[PDB]
Amino acid sequence: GFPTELKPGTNQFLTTDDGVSAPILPNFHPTPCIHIPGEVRNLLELCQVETILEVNNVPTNATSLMERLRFPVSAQAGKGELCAVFRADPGRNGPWQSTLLGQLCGYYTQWSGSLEVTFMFTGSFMATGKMLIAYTPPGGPLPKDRATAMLGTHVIWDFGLQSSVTLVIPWISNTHYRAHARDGVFDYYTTGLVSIWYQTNYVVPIGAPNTAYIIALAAAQKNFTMKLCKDASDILQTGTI
Amino acid sequence: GFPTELKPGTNQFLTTDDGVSAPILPNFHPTPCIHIPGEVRNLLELCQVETILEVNNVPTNATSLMERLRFPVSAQAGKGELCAVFRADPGRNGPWQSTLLGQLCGYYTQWSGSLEVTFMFTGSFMATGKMLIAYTPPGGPLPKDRATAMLGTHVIWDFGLQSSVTLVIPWISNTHYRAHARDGVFDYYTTGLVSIWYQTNYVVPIGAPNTAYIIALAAAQKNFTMKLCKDASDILQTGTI
Amino acid sequence: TINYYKDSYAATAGKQSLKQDPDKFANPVK
Amino acid sequence: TINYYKDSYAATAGKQSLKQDPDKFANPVK
Amino acid sequence: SDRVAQLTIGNSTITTQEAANIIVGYGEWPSYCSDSDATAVDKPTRPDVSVNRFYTLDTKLWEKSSKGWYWKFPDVLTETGVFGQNAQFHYLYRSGFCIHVQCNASKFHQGALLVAVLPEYVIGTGADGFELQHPYVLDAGIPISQLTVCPHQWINLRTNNCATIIVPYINALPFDSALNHCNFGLLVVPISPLDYDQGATPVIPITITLAPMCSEFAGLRQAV
Amino acid sequence: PAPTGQDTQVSSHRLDTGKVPALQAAEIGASSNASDESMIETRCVLNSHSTAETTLDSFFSRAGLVGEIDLPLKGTTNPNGYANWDIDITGYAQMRRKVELFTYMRFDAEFTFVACTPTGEVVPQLLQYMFVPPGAPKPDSRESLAWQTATNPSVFVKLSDPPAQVSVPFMSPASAYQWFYDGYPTFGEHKQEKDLEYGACPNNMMGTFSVRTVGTSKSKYPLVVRIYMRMKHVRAWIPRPMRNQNYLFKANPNYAGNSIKPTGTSRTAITTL
Amino acid sequence: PAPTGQDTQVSSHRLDTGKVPALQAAEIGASSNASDESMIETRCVLNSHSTAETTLDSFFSRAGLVGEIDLPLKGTTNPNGYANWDIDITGYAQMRRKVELFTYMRFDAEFTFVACTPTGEVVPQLLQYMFVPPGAPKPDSRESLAWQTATNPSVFVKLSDPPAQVSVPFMSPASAYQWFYDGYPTFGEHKQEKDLEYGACPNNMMGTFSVRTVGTSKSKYPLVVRIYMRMKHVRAWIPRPMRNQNYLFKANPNYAGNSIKPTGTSRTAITTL
Ligand SMILES: CCCCCCCCCCCCC/C=C\[C@H](O)[C@H](N)CO
Ligand SMILES: CCCCCCCCCCCCC/C=C\[C@H](O)[C@H](N)CO
Q: CATH number of the domain that B215 lies in?
């Protein structure tokens, strides 16, 4: 018949290949598909939904595992005290590991885009105060005081009727994409740091609680993209199931 | 020659495949086909022909194997007595195993459509009476009395010149298709139950027989369909033939 | 039908035509 | 999509259509 | 303008003066089963006014050490009202739901709740609801921090005192039984614990109100 | 035409005398005609279920086992490295019950032969399958002169190669194959001996299948050959009731008379499930 | 449409009262809407990054292990040369965690079977993979009569040949597969025994997979078969939060209650990295 030749790529089973195979059921018609609400057409559609961030990931015991979702705030001596810090690296293990964005990003090697962190105040109605949230780009170490942190991009948050403010972390980088950061050589892709400072005080009249809590929600902007699919770093089994 | 590549599916013999093969007889012309009456073009054409149903499948011995085709009817005290019950599952082993629809349905995993059961009275001309036939949808257990069975869809049958009535079992289901029902988990696809109750009595004058019989014929409607061909559950051999 | 030889009986099964005549066996009454 | 058989479910995955509706999950407010 | 609200349906009415708008689940209002989706052959019944109205279920107390509660739908209403009677007299059921959660306190209290709806809530190891044992993993091995991906709202005691969610019919079948399948479960978890100083009112009840919308039934038989 | 199942039209209640869809007379011999929309209150349903899987081609174009040949090293069946097998389909129950639903069939075929050792191992060996039409010289040994296959079709293949397959036309002198033949094939007197030819239809005897291992001396491995058959371009006529009891002999409807069994299962009482 | 990421428009400083993009009210339940060009001073950037790698097909059309079958020579599992395996996907963590992100899926499949000896060596041997739909006769031995595969699809292949693969349609009676089923499959009273059927969805039980070594006597090599699955034409609905703790049982969300662990890693203080 027709003379052919075989190239040195035959008989190999490649997992990611797209190929044609012989069907097992000739002339088969599946069940019709009715309309079911809530269809996903892209993993990026649900990469922009805010989820609770675990900034206060100090405790570990079983009975206090719920305390990791908020961090406390109270009255001080008005000297610009520090509240909490963390690293703004979605793929690196840390506070971001508790969000849907953090879990999904583990399936993709490289990402690019702007993030967004929202803080909500859950105190009494008569408690007022202001806070400063600062984002230090790469190169600068952790700020030692407020007057050093105010140099980078920052936003001043005022308590009031509107109880939520959003700090947008703009995409500032040297490369078009960033790989996942880790300790050692791969610190080249570190995004920076986030700090929260007392602005004036936490003022409260008589007969009202002295301690309040803040809840932080994180998500991604409209230019967030990921590529180069890989497998996750965590396996949820310890043998046969 | 032309360079090609081999995909990981070669050298396998797949039974359901449709392929081209080399003919053994070159330039062969078969015998012409004359017109023969009674041609079948679809297995669904002969799925709508009524066949005798074995409601009274009690006896087992050799000499009384013919008594399974009918069930008796006689005069009672007029208290709405029960006559006979069975399950309306075509694929499940039981009374339906004796029909052509029941045997054919064993070759297909899933079915959908409306069934139809016809009862014929074969008594004397002077015997009159009425019966109630009720179909209980899934969820309700076997009715304990007539006043509980009359709630579901039912038809009242009157003896007379027209000696046959048909009870139509409408397709009432949650899913588009049903798999074959069986004891255990697969009871999820049970269709329901069928019951026959005395309405008034079986009245007969002097000089006429006191016992009569009923013959039931079952078939399928015009929207009956089956899919996902499989092999039957019964093998009719006990070794080499 | 797909064929590669000179004989029509070596081709594939193909797709038939969906026609039914249920009245031949179910309603043969004159 | 590339197909060599009579059944549509034996073909390749092909290239989908790039459409997004992020407002379904993020902004469901009336 | 989205601070006062009135919701009326059937012969019941709900008013609130501190609202947080209305969340429509997955951006789809409830509707009836179209002629192409149906599979039954019998005409269904639509009682309309007699089963689409607000029902009040039970009251649960909020304490400084509470864990959380969850309910199941439509299991709660099967013994309540004409909706309950029709559910046990029919085999197939479909409907939507409008859910309203009420919890109010003074200006000197503080705390926050997480109200969310999670379809097909399989629980690992009635109308009064149950109390969670391991709220961190939602009693099913999934973290609670990602619950916001589901239709949800918050009850912040300094901002509002109510939450409203509208959920259409969610299932892979056009009709299903109401006595063997629970389409979704409602969750109410206190994320920020309640706090107040001695002398204030220490009882902060939580009450649940809900109303079926666009109900349908088929497959009549005896009551089961 | 019937590409999909029928729909259901909206119906309402009816209370009128003279028209009675429900009452029937099954003594006539025709199936019912009352529909769902004429005995209960129905809605509008748009059915779109395909009926393309129940066609004759969709039901018969699946491979099945029909044959078995043994070529042992030590034994009594075929100790000379050659075998003769008459072409019959009635040797196995699964395929026989399927094909016996009808009376006349007309179809092509696709035969596939799978060969291996009795333990399932594959060894390098050469064979020759030869199709012997009725009236051709049948081989009698491993080195028979008839193996020159001057006219009869033949196939040479090795065990290590993928199983060989061929396409087969319709070779009957009649217009179709028939699995039942109520009569005798000769004009004789039918005293007793002819009764062993009751039902023997000459129109179904298509020939003989011959297999050998190509060589002069005895081989070194025992071999087994399995013949699989698939139908295409199928036509059928005059359906008949399906089989009930076990099979006993090839091309014979004989059954065990002492052990007769019901078609389905049995219960204790008629008023209890 | 969204073929690429969004651009960034030039922005300047703004000092005006009444419009406040920054302040929000997350109690409503909707994500933010403030952008980069509304809280800092930005430039013009023309984004051309593709978003075609995050689609459902691009994320699910990759092969993964789902099955394992052992056919030992001496042992207790399958010492007769045949095995029966019910079709389940929840047997391995990597694929299960991926597929459990959503609630309803609708997809075709492409199955690839790789067979070799336990040491990895390849030997000449013949097998037969048989797909047994629910309600079909399941084989019980190596020479079972059900192996005639008169209707059920079957595949014959050798170890020395490249791994066999087939394409599989969507066979569910429902409109989609569901990995979570909050309910029971029977109308019973659910006293204690039914609780072992909690979550057992009949719409996911698709059948049985059967494998044997073609032969009459016992084979000569131990064999292992690995089943790999790939998805295509994928649709998804209603995403849910991802898994946190280890898996314990198939088709069960059970977790070890005594050993509960946080989602991520931990540090010593909140004011120190
Ligand atoms: C390479 C040569 C092998 C080809 C041999 C097969 C060709 C002939 C097959 C006949 C097809 C089936 C029809 C035969 C007749 C009936 O089935 C039986 N005799 C029933 O009585
Ligand atoms: C050569 C025959 C082999 C083909 C056998 C595979 C066909 C059936 C595969 C089913 C596809 C996956 C869907 C199955 C159901 C669910 O995954 C699980 N039961 C989860 O409960």
A: 2.60.120.20
